[model samples]
Target chain A: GSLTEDGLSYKEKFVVRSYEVGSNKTATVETIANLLQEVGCNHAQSVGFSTDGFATTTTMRKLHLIWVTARMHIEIYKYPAWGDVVEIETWCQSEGRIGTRRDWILKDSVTGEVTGRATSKWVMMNQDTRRLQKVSDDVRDEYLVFCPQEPRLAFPIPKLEDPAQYSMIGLKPRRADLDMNQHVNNVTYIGWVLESIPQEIVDTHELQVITLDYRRECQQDDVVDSLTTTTSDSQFLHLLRLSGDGQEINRGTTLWRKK
Target chain B: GSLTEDGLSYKEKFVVRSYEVGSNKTATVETIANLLQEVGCNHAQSVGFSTDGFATTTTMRKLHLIWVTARMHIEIYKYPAWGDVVEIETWCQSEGRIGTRRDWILKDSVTGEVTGRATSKWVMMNQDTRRLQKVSDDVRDEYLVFCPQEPRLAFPIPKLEDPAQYSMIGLKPRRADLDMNQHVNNVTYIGWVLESIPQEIVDTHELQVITLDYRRECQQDDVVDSLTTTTSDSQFLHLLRLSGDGQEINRGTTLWRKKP
Candidate 1:
């Protein structure tokens, strides 16, 4: 769980662990998300931008500001198998004035074949006030130097809000699932999203692409429902909603390929 | 992890990751167990005893046999911090004719001071028939050479069964909670056991010791109840029961200490 820098990007190599793999004997989407999280924090720490071991800088923490993910898009060309070592390279850039964007490339360490690509957007929030905040001069300048002058998005976010026909209800977060901020961790969300898809799809098909639009923070007490389209199209639309008030927590789209 | 051999012992080094640490900013007990599992499997693979990446040997797997944990005892002298590097050394020995035991010593890789020690017993089960099996000559021969002639136990297994006054019921396994064998994993059971303890204790105290005696297998469909003593005893005894039939899943005893 250590990282070395490569020019603008931070890189780490990991042997696909036995437990990290799913029933298909390949690394699960949740594992990929976890690796991304590890690297992101490592990158932040390397640049002296870490506070309380998170990506938040000392200036941001003094301002009671924390990073919150808003959206993400990931495409997987191949899933690393058990015992396969994969290297992930990640870098960050400014996403306009209110947010920051991070991108990653996952490749086989031995042969250098790309396996996955991902991009994400994160915005700052006032931890005490529970409100989104604009990047102030101090906050922006603290991390802006590490950013690239040019930014790249891994995939275009399509504007389709298709209806969902199938629903899995009453999903709750385990106490251990909470991160340092006490919210359902972004990695756990990936597992909940996959749990709602048809078991047949999970067993027969491999996840190729996944896009997420997070709308609300999920507390430990909040009960959730995962909604998905029932048709056998290659693409599926997903909605994670608060079961009690029907508030949308996240919206997602996934593409799958037969194994 | 990459393992190095020291005499009959196998060892590995690991950094405490950000995610591995808990809200307390220290490595969680479940994280320790996960590391032990990793090293144990690696040891088996190194010795050519691993068949499906698990500790089960080729002969055992061909006979439809798998290892099932029967008991474990762990003590944490100190909790590792977020960035601390811990070295774990482990070895295995025969626990009579039906079971085998494994032990570990967790130490700071740099300081060389011991932080934790654990011991566990495992027995073979017929995977297809769902029955326990005796260690046959062929099965024991495959791994016996790796075992020490004289066994050493990290902690003495005390014989004490107590009554529980409080209960937390209706605990179910998540879809992701199931492991490769599709059973409720051993690591998840530790979390469930801790979930039943009073939050005040969890907040104010650090776990010092824990011992578990597993009685039965837990299926994903089963609803579990965690029972514990309500009195503020230095040692707390826990029981995981199947809610449907009142079957004992696991019995546990945990000791806690106040944070300085």
Candidate 2:
């Protein structure tokens, strides 16, 4: 019912609770990721592309597949504190023949001030095979019909060079890391990246923006090496790699502001 | 709007999310604790006992103070799975001059079948001094108006024996364990208790019921000894104590059922 008339966007409001806050008494990065993911799922369901529907379709002929994030970029002007109510709005548009882009804007419900914005790219993947699948004409048509006419947020994400230049810390994926997809959720990567930062810096500075490029999926028991490099004042680069084979899992960059 | 006409009880619905589930694909014990705490907060706010209000009240003459759980008892008939919606209802009543009793009932939203019930005891504490305070007559009268007509589940909780008789594991509270209360959260204690149990038993059995008594508060960097004893084939007792002074932090008991 909260979906726009075009059926491409949906908006929801939430009150920040005590449990959702961190040591700073404000919403955590993980909480923001949770809200964004919820709106994305709701938008899919509002259309005819619910995960349950994809699960029931015959695998042989069905072109429809589940969407998975490829990359995400988030910029936060301020973090909502506990008891603060925030409104989140999300929408999607076709990226290409094989991808789609989704974006979100978070505003203070009472003051109507924009607090955060994020953009993400997604691609379809076969649920059973776990392989990338091209978006068929029917699939594109189903979602594009509802796409809004306005432009979406577009930004460039630069690649990190020679992860070896950064300090590395080892981490093991635990049972708590796995989601319904049976893989480490994307949000977990953000935690790993931040954990790799020096404690002194983390305690003195707040994250203002972060851009992540996911390279591969991680499973339980996979030992990951979280590497970080300080690029300049208040700017850093990071990488997550499998320890066994040195396979890249994800790359990210973060910009920080004085607390 | 979900509150009953009497305004004594409040009910809310929640869909179990994937992040809230455990390795078994069912809601974790800690997750259930989170939901119960939410209902308690909501009930207090609805009854004019907001946390902010308690914060502003003077310490000398004010009868209403910050409330904290002293003990809790939970029984689960079924663990909700991811994607399932469950309805939760909560209420409060006076326990004694120094304590209050609260209760909760959870049911399957779709089938309307009772799935869980819990009861908890709470006591007032001086926010500035961090010491237990007696509930004055005026404070008791404020909450007595909302007491349920009939008693809910009633059971006795026996005290745990010496920790020396049980197997023990050491635990250190981390930064992530802290909550808005500026101390280790109550739910983190549940996770520690379960983590001390043998993995074989944890994997083979499902937790059906648990009772916890908060003896003392735990803070960050506190090294705790989680001691447990198998009282019977399906029952166990637990004690969390500070390693430095052997000060008891909490005591608990858990009953398990064979996995179906």
Candidate 3:
């Protein structure tokens, strides 16, 4: 959380303000993203440095993804949101020839309970070569204090085999989804796919890995079908489709855990 | 548009910024919605008034429906990009019993060419009665001064029908879509819908109406099918599906038009 190991450190703090919620009183992903950017993680590289899925327990999954993608050095591997309060804790676990292993914990402040947690393995990569490399001494030392305990083998969960296990739930395209392309917009696929998930599961477990596949174009009036099937803690699959007559349009898969 | 009409000669000015882009560097429906709100229209009330179609031309048909969910009143619908100069002219077109009609024009400062134009019809409703009522003399007289040559019919264009007429696209699920329900977030859906469009349309036309129909749920990883069909002078109908192995998910329609 700190920029330096000793002094003020680079960790930035921000406030959650009004206008960040809907009539429901819950905060929005935009609020979280605004905080991340306000804290000086505006650049893709800087953003990637702060990402750790497991770090944000109560924040939205999309917000967590921003961190992971912006901070390429970290991995979320697991995380879950509970409510208004979000807790994020991170520590480096290993410094290998390639990258470092990082572990994180996310908690719900209101509930004073663990909302989500995860361990991520990352390899320091060369930007130009786009190849795995050793961690930079400066970065390694700067984050040394945050390096966490060695990672322990977490319990294993089941894997998904069939896609039909999940049921399709809800679908909608919002005005925000319309980009310059004037189409349904691509980023929305992520929202629709995530919308298919049952809230009960999100409040309880941490997500593991997610694989998404873009199938076709979606715009106003097209129907979307959401299907979700849980195989085990380790695996799950969700499918989104256009439902003009009930056919598959798009699909996705995700894995999760409790720890 | 100004909060007050100065005797059939109301005037207002604005600067176009980068934040207005929906995705492809074009003005977004929400931005247009905000422009309307700046002049005092409640977001919800705007939606209630335009429930059917826009008073002016229809540009939302080819647009994401999320834009029409709220009221749409504008003077300068589109903003100029960084360093791009823009000019806007707006006024009340007419005062009616239930609502009043509003109009706007967007132009290129350098070329002085009209880039976008629109005419909107608004109504006066009793918040308590929830019924359309006559415009108050005070409000009408205040707005009439700004009326411009009875707004020329929003430049008309052909209507777009089939979704297959345009390139259909898709996107992957992001963690942001999850909400307390752990389902795809509602507002996030609007953002995705915006991302699905091509920027050229937004830059050239003014969005008029957008309507959405929720069918099913979009989950993480579900590929969505996006289709657009041009209808008329910027009017179009867009469709979105879950790529549900070719099934239906949800659909929407929008309308738009170029400035006269």
Candidate 4:
């Protein structure tokens, strides 16, 4: 007699509508977070992001959390890589003043399975001297209850091509591209970089992830470029370069994949 | 002798930027009045519109300036036609507690000439009742200096196309086009009409004049259609229909000329 038909299979789920999560338009992280908070998703800090790194899909990682661990004046021991959803997980872990931990499981939308997970630790700090401080009782008690029993397994970084090595590539800054901080908005850079790609690619591809390492300030008139070198299994390393006169100004890398 | 030797014989001008001269991007006779006022021209009520009835480029026999006084209300007219500068010249004659009298001059931007002029009387009203009240002396003195010394020359309304006799070739309700009131903004309608022109023709020609008469409010999801027919010298009368059954929503005309 055959066993009962109890097997599971995965199917690709497509996103019918996608919005760039930012202040520019609707579906921004801040707006969504504020709404969620209003609806009682309190203490929601962006802990981690995972993506398949396509032009359309990378927006999943563009989510910026309002609260930062650095706000307590603690020196961050590490900054998570752009391609990895580590930083957010680290912030979640540090929810309590003294110390706390948090973790996230990122899943692929189409496949309906976990792609990666991240965990991090955070603690309170003395703002005046910029030193680590003990967690207060109130902060510690509030965070202690949300701790999960186990940590999540790590995912391998996708191998990818860097976009910076390409010749004849350049970046032009528009005044409209600047954010409130007088720097080119980080997402604006992504838009500029993506514009260099053929429109057909954007319309077709299902991206896996995008990791933006904001290396240096890209000011007005700064010419930026990318060097993209594909490595293996649909993975590419995208290196962002800001340079002129044969000298490099700033650089970054993004790891992405396609289905 | 080179004709250029006589002080370079010619001049060149280019428009790097252009925008409608109205408040909050709405269309109304008063907006035209405001445009006039901002430019130190008179309102149409005190100075009646100046028009020419003959030897004209248009076919309309008589031009009527029907001023609708509103209490904190907006008046939207038509889109100016292609190649129409739509200069709104205004001068404040009196500012009273109850109301004010304003004058206006609408001009053709290209020829540095006046196209039409008008004057209007305004009265402050109760927010609830919309009743006109008496003028205060302080309000009257603030605006009297802007009155114009000489009124614009009156011209007859050139015979223009009748709004009733046009066929709508296109109709669309732009849902993404909403304004402060969450309704389809009036300017967006003009944009829709403007976009209907083939890119090639638009790139080659300049629009001269546009007159829009808004009869009804266009809210969200309201379908607006446009009808067009040739009227006069390189001019076409455009009417916007709201219903699929050809109900009139907005009406305008556009004139054009190829780049020299």
Classified by CAPRI criteria, candidate 4 counts as incorrect
List the global CA lDDT of all models. Answer: 0.78, 0.73, 0.45, 0.35
What would the per-residue lDDT of candidate 3 be over residues A63-109, giving only the tens digit for each residue?
22211221211123322221244545444454444555444444454
lDDT score, candidate 1: 0.78
Give the TM-score ranking, best first: 1, 2, 3, 4
Off by over 4 Å in 1: A1-7, A51-54, A152-164, A231-233, B1-7, B51-54, B156-165, B231-233
Top candidate, metric lDDT: 1
Off by over 4 Å in 4: A1-259, B1-176, B196-200
Please give, for residues B87-149, the per-residue lDDT of candidate 2 as tens digits.
898877676786778789989999999899899888788656668977667666566677775
Fraction of native contacts, model 4: 0.00
lDDT for residue B233 in candidate 1, whole number 0-100: 28
What DockQ values do the models have?
0.51, 0.28, 0.16, 0.02
- Evaluated against the true structure, the overall lDDT of model 4 is 0.35
Q: Write the per-residue lDDT of candidate 1 for residues A62-109, one digit (tens) a residue.
A: 988888889888899998987799999888888767788889999999
Candidate 2 matches the true fold with a TM-score of 0.77
Please write out the lDDT profile of model 2 over residues A105-175, one tens digit for every residue.
99999999999999998877876677887777666666676677667663434555664555545565543
> Can you give the lDDT of residue B206 in candidate 2?
83
